[PDB]
Amino acid sequence: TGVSAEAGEQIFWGDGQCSTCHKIGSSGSATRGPDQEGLAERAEERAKELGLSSGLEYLVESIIDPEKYVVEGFDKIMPRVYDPPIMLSREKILAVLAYLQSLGGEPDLDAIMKFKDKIPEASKTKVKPWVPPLAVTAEEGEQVFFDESLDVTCGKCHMVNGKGQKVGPELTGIGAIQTPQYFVESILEPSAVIVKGYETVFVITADGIPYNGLIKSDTEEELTLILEESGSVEEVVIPKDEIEDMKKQEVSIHPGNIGELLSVRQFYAVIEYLRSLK
Ligand code: HEC
Ligand code: HEC
Ligand SMILES: [Ca+2]
Ligand SMILES: [Ca+2]
Ligand SMILES: [Ca+2]
Ligand SMILES: [Ca+2]
């Protein structure tokens, strides 16, 4: 569809997967990444802070090396979209850059095209095939994911296509977006990346009672938390008028001991299941 902001808009909201994490003002509802309304002017400010040549250069860097600068208040969750699974082509990345410049600015197509030689070509990805060390399948991993007889049951906290229970985020579609490495880290190192909105808070009430958990809901009169202990979860409803302090902690309720609770087979099967969630 060429290199035009119009093409880029279709890709951002489509096969680039950008809108699965980013909203633009009142368009979209995704929150895993920052709202991109006003991004073109923000990029000019980022480039100044970072000693880059232009806002455009910051936008390019943000796609080609997402980890190089991490927006405050977010973790290293954005994938390299020119690598698997997304495998977004170079022409589509150039188009998306034109779209990003249109978010409060003016696309500069000649300037974008000069960055072509810095954008990796998806077909030339250097990522190696994911090969688990024993034979596992996605269907086997689905069984593990929902198995309530294990010492961890992913489905107690994550929904897929209407199955499971919501504590952490819904995982439907994540295999179209994320890498097996991100799945490994998410399972075994849960606090390395905290999905936005799923932070643990530490609350203290006026009566001196502590509660540490994630926020399920937050109304004008009640804060509902989900607490976790030994893989089980529990709700508590705290009257807002009784809250003395609340602080976000960079820690996850996803358990930290899954490497002790899943066999090698179960673990690699679950990864294959996650990859399959297109
Ligand atoms: C969720 C898994 C994401 C996907 C898919 C995409 N992005 Fe993203 N992006 C995400 C986060 C959490 C962050 C902030 C942390 C960081 O890496 O800096 C970003 C950031 C950006 C930025 C910078 C925004 C800023 O305010 O400075 C840009 C320009 C950006 N992301 C672009 C972008 C595009 C075009 C995507 C589709 C090809 C895309 N992102 C996907 C999370 C996620
Ligand atoms: C509730 C006590 C949980 C259990 C059991 C499991 N997960 Fe979890 N997970 C939970 C939360 C609250 C969060 C968000 C905060 C964070 O740590 O990032 C997560 C996150 C993930 C992710 C990342 C999702 C994303 O959108 O990027 C993945 C891939 C994930 N969790 C996988 C997963 C698996 C496979 C589990 C069973 C072995 C599992 N989780 C259990 C909460 C809880
Ligand atoms: Ca970044
Ligand atoms: Ca995590
Ligand atoms: Ca009140
Ligand atoms: Ca209790």
Residue numbers in the entry: 39 to 316
Question: How do the authors describe this structure?
Answer:
To improve our confidence in the assignment of the various transitions, we mutated the distal methionine ligands in both the N- and C-terminal heme sites to histidine and cysteine. To confirm that the sites can accommodate these mutations while maintaining six-coordinate heme binding and calcium binding, we determined the crystal structures of the C-terminal domain methionine mutants M292H and M292C to 1.12 and 1.70 Å resolution, respectively using the same crystallization conditions as for the wt protein, that is, including 200 mM Ca2+. This showed that these mutants are able to support both six-coordinate heme ligation as well as calcium binding, although in the M292H mutant, the plane of the distal His292’s side chain is at an angle of ∼75° with the plane of the heme porphyrin system rather than perpendicular to it. The M→H mutants, however, yielded data with clear transitions and little hysteresis. As the mutation of a distal methionine to histidine in a c-type cytochrome typically results in a drop in redox potential of ∼320 mV, in each mutant, one of the two transitions in each of the two pairs can be expected to drop by approximately this amount. In addition, mutations of either of the heme sites’ distal heme-coordinating methionine to histidine change the relative amplitudes of the various transitions. To at least some extent, this could be explained by changes in extinction coefficients caused by the mutation. However, it is also possible that these mutations have compromised calcium binding. That the crystal structures of the mutant showed a fully occupied calcium site in both domains is probably because of the high (200 mM) calcium concentration used in crystallization.
